[PDB]
């Protein structure tokens, strides 16, 4: 139940490019699509 702190969190995480993480995120999500289907 930390909705307020979430704003204080995204503000600190935003220190790193919020577009650079998403780049590295898609190259990790597309893995889990077939990397977790046999390794939960």
Curated annotation (Swiss-Prot):
Residues recorded with modification Phosphoserine: 17
Modified residue annotations for Tyrosine amide: 40
Name the record gives this protein: Peptide YY(3-36)
Covered residues, full protein: 41 to 64 of 97
